[PDB]
């Protein structure tokens, strides 16, 4: 089987974030113009999607991590990954 990725970007540098679901776990790689480095995101999941938006120059990232029929939303708003309110009845 294959790892599964999701990607987002912002600005004109740009910043890029790539999330990889590998063998039950999601991790994050980061580009800020000067080489790829490892991000702070680490959460369980077999499937991942992502979206992001800016308020001014402040990025807001939402990562949707799924295992079985449960999807958990993880939020980056400048100061730590927090659990979002997203729910669904799958």
Ligand X SMILES: Cc1c(C)c2c3c4c1OP(=O)(O)Oc1c(C)c(C)c5c(c1C4)Cc1c(c(c(C)c(C)c1OP(=O)(O)O5)OP(=O)(O)O2)C3
Ligand Y SMILES: OC[C@@]1(O)OC[C@@H](O)[C@@H](O)[C@@H]1O
Interaction pattern, residues 33-62, with Cl ion; x per rule: CB under 5 A: --xx---x----------------------
Whole-number Å distance between alpha carbons of 43 and 19 = 10
Residue 48's alpha-carbon distances to 9, 54, 76, 81, in angstroms, are 16, 21, 15, 15
- Quick one: what does residue 45 bind among Cl ion, ligand X, ligand Y, none, with the CB cut-off 5 to 8 Å set by partner type? none
CB atoms within 10 A of CB 48: 25
User: Is 39 a residue that touches ligand Y (CB under 6 A)?
Assistant: yes
Q: Which residues between 14 and 73 bind ligand X (CB under 6 A)? A: 46
- Residue 71 near residue 90 (C-beta atoms within 8 A): yes
Annotated binding site: 1, 7, 46, 60
**Of the listed pieces 1-9, 45-53, 67-75, 80-88, which binds Cl ion according to CB under 5 A?**
80-88
């Amino acid at each position: 089987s294959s790892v599964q990725t999701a990607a987002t970007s912002w600005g004109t540098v740009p910043s890029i974030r790539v999330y990889t679901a590998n063998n039950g776990k999601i991790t994050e790689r980061c580009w800020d113009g000067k080489g790829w480095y490892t991000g702070a995101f680490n959460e369980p999941g077999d499937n991942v999607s992502v979206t992001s938006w800016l308020v001014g120059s402040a990025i807001h990232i939402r990562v949707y991590a799924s295992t079985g029929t449960t999807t958990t939303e993880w939020c980056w708003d400048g100061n730590g990954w927090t659990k979002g309110a997203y729910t669904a009845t799958n």
